[PDB]
Design an enzyme around this catalytic site. Structure first.
Site, PDB file in Angstrom:
ATOM      1  N   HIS A   1       0.818  -1.219   0.000  1.00  0.00           N
ATOM      2  CA  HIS A   1       0.000   0.000   0.000  1.00  0.00           C
ATOM      3  C   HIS A   1       0.854   1.274   0.000  1.00  0.00           C
ATOM      4  O   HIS A   1       0.463   2.294   0.581  1.00  0.00           O
ATOM      5  CB  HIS A   1      -0.990   0.035   1.177  1.00  0.00           C
ATOM      6  CG  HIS A   1      -1.961  -1.110   1.213  1.00  0.00           C
ATOM      7  ND1 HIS A   1      -3.306  -0.951   0.946  1.00  0.00           N
ATOM      8  CD2 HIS A   1      -1.795  -2.418   1.532  1.00  0.00           C
ATOM      9  CE1 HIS A   1      -3.923  -2.113   1.089  1.00  0.00           C
ATOM     10  NE2 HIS A   1      -3.030  -3.020   1.444  1.00  0.00           N
TER      11      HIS A   1
ATOM     12  N   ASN B   1      -9.976  -2.901   3.443  1.00  0.00           N
ATOM     13  CA  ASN B   1      -9.830  -2.737   1.996  1.00  0.00           C
ATOM     14  C   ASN B   1     -11.171  -2.385   1.371  1.00  0.00           C
ATOM     15  O   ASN B   1     -12.199  -2.394   2.055  1.00  0.00           O
ATOM     16  CB  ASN B   1      -9.297  -4.026   1.345  1.00  0.00           C
ATOM     17  CG  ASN B   1      -7.798  -4.215   1.551  1.00  0.00           C
ATOM     18  OD1 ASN B   1      -7.076  -3.261   1.828  1.00  0.00           O
ATOM     19  ND2 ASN B   1      -7.330  -5.451   1.410  1.00  0.00           N
TER      20      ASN B   1
END
Ligand code: HEM
Ligand code: HEM
Lengths: 680, 678, 370
Positions: free
Chosen positions: B65, B138
């Site tokens: 990420h 997510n």
């Protein structure tokens, strides 16, 4: 094998059982749990040693030039150059020295696109038998600024805005143009960045420059001033901006893949190493000060002299261990070379040593396999995070009776030690100033601009129009025009149109009509078309594919990389239309019969986005590529409004098309397809 | 102001002289030199302190990420939820808690494009009065793998090949599809990432999920199993792949700029926090194991219960100090919440604390302004790199007569201490295994696929076709088809077409026709069109520009973001054709008169690339956007073969065009423009 | 285990080595010892600070001799170059290598198959852990009387540094749970009241192997002997013969004199009793224990007497050859005492070597209530 010395640290895991980092065979696909659907145990040493290593994988990217790729190779000297330098690697004809070269952009972070518009890095390490010698250069011969102390200002201004970290890998924003206009020394490099040098076709199609004037020094201590040049043997080539942008999205790895593929396919790129050599007494004889890195030395005053050639022929085995970890420094100098009082170079010597402490988190980064010299290290340095050696000499200090004077001092006469140029002197007051000789910021940008073709000039102008149109501050845009106008009144006028600002009055102090050779890209045909890519548009229906196959085999014999494209991966098909884009290719050819996918039922497949085959041919044409159609495929050309006998368009039988395309590839880009101010 | 507590560390340099980092006014634009054209001196302390700081600016990117952006905001509880949790931020109606949220992709490094296809992160910090509580989620409700020990395997396989570091931010390569087909648990998340969830319109148009089953715990120690959901109030929206690719090059910052702009324009995005709540006895009741993170719990078995609302309304002042430095952890838990024995979640607890040691180069990262709680830190921790406080208690150990028992122990009964759910037990042998209840990797991907619209299904098929065709190894492609076939024979067959292979014969073991609500993106219209972007193609010649101004003024009064485009920056022009691209807009409108740039001499200016205005209208149409032309500008629609009668295509007067465009923006994408197999 | 090679570079080898209890191999396993359990986490984690990166096992002193094959990559200071580009498992592309090992294949590590977890998740310790007093008493019971006195005098010394009176009282309360006698004896030094017995944990049991002073040494090899001599007269020639014999018997000998004359290993200025296991005065060297000889600018006043004094008072074998007996007399030490030797060279050597086996002569230490 240039990578030969690295073999001893290579680790083969084939045919082996999994282990921890401290040995002992293991399994590591299940966490240890307390009962069937239980919580994970802290005593699972296997889980923790595996995840810890993963958790700690990343190191800081380079503060600039974070995005890049590299390869190993060999440099070969064309002669004994001891008449001009004591440098060992240039000491004999046919003398070979392993190299590693990393190419890069400047502004963008690690994952940004190769085909962003930017200055590009071109950094070479020579692993000489008298130490590592680095030439840390760029694909453009002049730099934005004149004193190293201003580097954080430049870099801060071109990198993303610090409030939102926008925009990535681009100078198309307020702060960058505020800087370029507030610090006019930047204008010269800016012009080069706005030209084809800002968006090259590949790393292999770039020249390279040390930029700074350095010194070559002979055994007896006599010096000459020198500029380093890398001259590409593949020829210079550039994209067009509207193409580079699509490519940034379609393949961010365009350049690193190009280099990798060329080397994998046995087409190792080469550059010649050349120098301009200048007497010490002529440092200020050519209309500028040779200590000023915002100026280059026109080849008409001092021609290139070729010393040798470098060939990159081995990819790395592990990109991180090799490419990411390698630590270049201009401070990596050897006997026979010296610095000059270039205030930009001066500060670099400090900064690249220092920045390694952050990137490698310790002082022993020269012990990393990719950084190690081949010539051996003997000194009294000890300890330091990650110390990889065990030193035998317990008397780690000089001078000393107990160590018999070893390791021993080396200088000009003993031990072939480094020595500073004997004639160099300091004179005058300690000062925080720059020489007034550095003050002309406009004459050379004008010289550069005069020396490009009319369409190349247009590309520069359109690059500026594109970039400055993103600047929201009106005054910054005015400041930009004001500076542009000091270089060229016509340039300012043409840029001003896009910005909707008034054409400003001539400011002719620095105007001139002089030209110099060798700074253009597009007006010289490529000396080879090996590796260049041909996308062949075909179809799975009918006999098109078998024709496509024959076309491919012929083009390949001539050294080209051919991609046969169709609706799906049929036998002979290299790539689907869904996966295809014109940006991937240097030439686009429609195979006979494939006109069926440019109109009608054949163009209406669920297998690719609507219009894809036509868009590919259209992009290829509009971006100046050689485009062609074999036989009945000429219909595809008509379907997109392209006429059969245009420049760089080939229509006919296979033999014709092949001939035409290969000719077209040498021209590379057909510039008559681009409008120039004053056509409507 | 959610950033209020950060004000004491804000530094204003306006109206000040330049200084070193240890104080003292200076100039720093010239190196100190020995003589006019002399070498730089080592005693230039000013040069070294400035360049040292620059040389050391970078810190390692997140191991995953890395690419993302965030903002501050406020969460408001809609109720006193003490009947389900002891958690303080949920303990009273209208109770407000500062938040920070970071959205991200997964695989790409830091400067990779926002519109790469990828799973997306949606990480939320609640700065509660009982400690920082993070929901690190997510935009997809299930994860690729079932045990955290396989995380480096999954991530190595999706990230660039380690020999050449290709390809950036893409799963479209051999190793990824090798892993997905070798580790079939991955198939469910894969299907989601191959849908619209993989290429969302913006962070603001994403839902979020904690994925794992957690526990909510009341003061008395009773627990309920919980799933966290963030439901976007902007509605879900996604791009198409051919568009996302061009957008990756035209604007890598599309999503971070979208979020930034919406907040500055006073269009702060909101999400509702909702939960599914089930009794402990339901763990294995719904045809799968709730400890298995590769499955979601269909809403038909347990409906969403809305707890509150989070609104992001402040951008950061310094991206690095706030967004880049913030350190999320699933281990950031508070009284009233507990973990479950989810083997994926279990390992995360270790990984996020540990990785901060690498990213922040020391143990005191919780002292960073963006990481500090609002609730007070009192313990016997001392020293460590960068220690920012000075501790008054010299008896830094427990138990102790000398510190009179302070700081004191807190537990379930005293001091509102954290406590593990009291009824949790362990039973059986220590094992390096997973439960057999985890074994079905195929039923839910089929459930997901069944629950999409026919064109949405095609998009999933076409994403797989695109990606799998990049795989060089034939056997890996065959492996992929074998695995897809266990999910749906039709899917396998349709993907196999692109690959030029034969799909295996149907394997009915896991096939089924069940569907579940709320997993589709395109099937529902958007609840608001505020902030959506309209590119208005005009021209500097004649009367187009003035009419474009009028169109813009009307559209903006209805909440839209309008960009007037023309050949150069004339008065009232927002952007040049050279700088414009269809990817930047949600709708494209040709202003009357602008038809002159679609054919003839008007289309051949050196101010823009050949065909540019036609390409923007063409891209806009083929990518499914509302497209329109006012008055005589219908000639532009005609020039590209688009007919006025089509859905999502609008012509006529400014009033008919505006109304049609605004209605089309609710539909968002016109899926009838995309071909489906057969 | 025999340790027979010193390191070549202390930092690279000794300072850098990184031990972990989690460094375990097939055939060994952990137990549910709550102290052991936490150490497993701590030693791995702490290397990240001390070595500033995840690759410390690659340091030469940390490397195993047995081969490392896994899918770990990168990290600070990565010293290797991995050939396998499919750095994940499971995988078709790497053909299953590196491969899983377990109890049955590849001699993989395995957790003891029979270990079970049972009960509630708890932040507690078993009540079986609650007796903190019985074994301290067992230990104390199993030392010699003077050895016991050493323990008491160590506690008396340390606790007397404690400024806080209640802490000192708390200590006595805990000591008294182990032994009332120990508590009383310590309490004397702290000037606190001898507390009332609490017999709950008192016992008279003893166990073998915990005493140090109860056993003579198995060898005197390496033990040092400092020979006090002088550059005046024939002492040094005699010190030399004494040294030659003692070193033949495996001891390490330092001849000490006013200056570094031939045969002299150390000066009185540089010398101290702490360096040696035995101290013997060479014949003739009594001249530096009084009079003119004791008063030299070459060493601090009283140095040779202080060395003999410290040597005796610290329980070492002490001796003097021939006329050097006067040196013993000068400090009030008598030849009849245990671990004191006088007479000819032969007698002294035999005596010193027998005394080195006893090592410390505990008769010289007063015991409470003697
Ligand atoms: C002629 C002017 C310059 C040239 C040609 C140049 C070129 C380069 C190149 C090619 C790299 C990347 C090397 C690689 O591939 O790893 C680089 C990195 C770097 N440059 Fe320069 N640069 C110039 C000016 C400067 C100045 C003025 C400074 C600061 C005083 C500076 C500081 C740095 C730093 C700190 C790095 C990162 C090095 C590392 O992390 O290993 N550069 N430069
Ligand atoms: C349900 C499964 C998962 C979810 C929802 C998830 C989500 C996320 C998110 C949103 C971030 C970025 C936080 C930010 O914006 O800074 C992140 C980063 C990270 N994740 Fe996870 N992830 C999951 C699985 C895992 C697993 C299984 C592991 C390791 C065992 C892991 C280790 C990490 C690490 C080390 C980071 C970087 C943290 C930092 O540098 O601050 N993740 N994850």
């Amino acid at each position: 094998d240039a990578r030969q010395r690295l073999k001893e640290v290579e680790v083969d895991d084939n045919g082996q059982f999994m282990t921890t980092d401290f040995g002992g065979n293991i399994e590591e696909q299940f966490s240890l749990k307390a009962g069937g659907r239980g919580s994970t145990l802290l005593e699972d040493f296997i889980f923790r040693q595996k995840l810890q290593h993963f958790d700690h994988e990343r190191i800081p990217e380079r503060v600039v030039h974070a995005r890049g790729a590299g390869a190993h190779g060999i440099f070969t000297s064309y002669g004994d150059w001891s008449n001009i330098t004591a440098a060992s690697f240039l000491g004999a004809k046919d003398k070979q020295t392993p190299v590693f070269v990393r190419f890069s952009t400047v502004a963008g972070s690690r994952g940004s696109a190769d085909t962003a518009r930017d200055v590009h890095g071109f950094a070479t390490r020579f692993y000489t038998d008298e130490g590592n010698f680095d030439i840390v250069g760029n694909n453009i011969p002049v730099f934005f600024i004149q004193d190293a102390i201003r580097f954080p200002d430049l870099i801060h201004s071109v990198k993303p805005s610090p409030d939102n970290e926008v925009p990535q890998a681009a100078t198309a924003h307020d702060s960058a143009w505020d800087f370029f206009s507030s610090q006019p020394s930047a204008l010269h490099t800016l012009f080069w960045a706005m030209s084809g040098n800002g968006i090259p076709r590949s790393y292999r199609h770039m020249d390279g420059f040390g930029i700074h004037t350095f010194r070559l020094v002979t055994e007896d201590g006599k010096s000459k001033l020198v500029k380093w040049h890398w001259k590409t043997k593949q020829g210079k080539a550039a994209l067009v901006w509207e193409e580079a942008q699509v490519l940034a999205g379609k393949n961010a790895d365009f350049h690193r893949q190009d280099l990798w593929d060329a080397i994998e396919s046995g087409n190792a790129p080469s550059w010649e190493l050349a120098v301009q050599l200048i007497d010490e007494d002529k440092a200020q004889a050519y209309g500028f000060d040779l200590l000023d890195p915002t100026k280059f030395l026109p080849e008409e005053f001092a021609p290139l002299q070729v010393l040798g050639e470098m060939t990159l022929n081995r990819n790395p085995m592990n990109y991180f261990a090799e490419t990411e970890q390698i630590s270049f420094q201009p401070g990596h100098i050897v006997r026979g070379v010296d610095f000059t009082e270039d205030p930009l170079l001066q500060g670099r010597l400090y900064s690249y040593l220092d920045t390694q402490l952050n990137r490698h988190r310790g002082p022993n980064f020269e012990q990393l396999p990719i950084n190690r010299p081949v010539s051996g290290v003997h000194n009294n340095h000890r300890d330091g995070q990650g110390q990889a050696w065990i030193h035998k000499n317990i008397h780690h200090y000089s001078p000393s009776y107990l160590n018999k004077g070893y390791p021993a001092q080396a200088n000009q006469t003993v031990g072939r030690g480094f020595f500073t140029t004997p004639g160099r002197t300091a004179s005058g007051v300690l000062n925080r100033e720059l020489s007034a000789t550095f003050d002309d910021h406009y004459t050379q940008p004008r010289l550069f601009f005069n020396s490009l073709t009319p369409v190349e000039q247009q590309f520069v102008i359109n690059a500026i129009r594109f970039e400055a149109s993103h600047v929201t501050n009106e005054q910054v845009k005015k400041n930009v025009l004001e500076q542009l106008n000091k270089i060229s009144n016509d340039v300012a006028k043409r840029v001003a149109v896009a910005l909707g600002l008034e054409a400003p009055q001539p400011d002719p102090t620095y105007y001139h009509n002089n030209v110099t050779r060798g700074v253009s890209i597009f007006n010289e045909s490529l000396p080879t078309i090996a590796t260049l890519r041909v996308g062949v548009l075909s179809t799975t229906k009918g006999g098109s594919l078998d024709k496509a196959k024959a076309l491919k085999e012929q083009l390949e014999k001539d050294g080209l990389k051919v991609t046969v494209i169709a609706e799906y991966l049929a036998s002979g098909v290299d790539q689907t239309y869904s996966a295809a884009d014109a940006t991937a290719f240097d030439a686009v050819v429609v195979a006979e019969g494939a006109e069926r996918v440019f109109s009608g039922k054949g163009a209406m497949s669920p297998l690719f986005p609507a219009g894809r085959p036509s868009q590919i041919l259209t992009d290829g044409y509009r971006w100046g590529k050689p485009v062609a159609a074999v036989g009945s495929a000429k219909k595809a050309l008509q379907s997109i409004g392209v006429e059969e006998k245009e420049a760089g368009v080939y229509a006919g039988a296979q033999d014709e098309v092949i001939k035409g395309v290969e000719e077209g590839l040498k021209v590379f880009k057909f510039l008559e397809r681009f409008a120039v101010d004053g056509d409507d």
